[PDB]
Design a protein around this ligand. Structure first.
Ligand SMILES: CNC(=O)[C@@H]1CNCCO1
Length: 185
């Protein structure tokens, strides 16, 4: 893949974050706190899950960014509609406005409905995410394995502005405290 040249500088939007998340000063790293982070509630915040959105909104063009997932046991990554539900329980699916992959219990899966098994020989430490708005494509790349393709959602019906999407996962096990980090360009 030669998507690197569509690289965009993504920053996290504090106002969307679950109240337990801790976003770094530079707005490039997020991790699960061990408690409520002493913020007011608002209608933007994801209530049920440790999720946060990027600040950037995309309605055209080609966009690429990379996320570091080193030593995490669980996470969700991708893009979503700006108008996704924030409160209560929901599934990550294109019907609900999400184009995502995840790691969960030692398996990788794409957020289709129902979910699709991914085939990854080299556990990734960094994930590349490519969006082509006009083409209706979201693709995921294994940066650790020379940029090998993980998954392509095609014929996507975005139906609105897109935002980068993150879930750091719960840390019930004590083995999932590590942050998600936006990697430098
Ligand atoms: C349909 N399933 C989901 O939405 C979640 C996403 N997080 C990992 C487990 O599955």
């Amino acid at each position: 893949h030669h998507h690197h040249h569509h690289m965009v500088h993504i920053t996290l939007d504090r106002n969307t974050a679950n109240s337990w998340l801790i976003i770094s000063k530079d707005r490039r790293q997020v991790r699960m706190g061990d408690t409520h982070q002493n913020v007011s509630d608002n209608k933007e915040r994801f209530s049920n899950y440790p999720m946060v959105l990027g600040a950037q909104r995309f309605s055209s063009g080609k966009m690429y960014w990379e996320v570091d997932v080193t030593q995490k046991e669980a996470w969700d990554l991708g893009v979503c509609r700006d108008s996704v539900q924030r409160k209560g329980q929901f599934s990550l699916s294109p019907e609900n406005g999400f184009w995502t992959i995840w790691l969960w219990q030692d398996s990788y899966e794409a957020g289709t409905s129902p979910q699709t098994t991914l085939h990854i020989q080299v556990p990734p430490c960094q994930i590349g995410i490519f969006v082509d708005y006009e083409a209706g494509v979201v693709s995921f790349y294994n940066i650790t394995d020379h940029g090998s393709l993980i998954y392509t959602f095609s014929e996507c019906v975005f139906a609105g502005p897109l935002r980068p999407f993150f879930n750091v996962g719960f840390n019930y096990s004590g083995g999932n405290a590590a942050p998600l980090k936006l990697c430098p360009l």
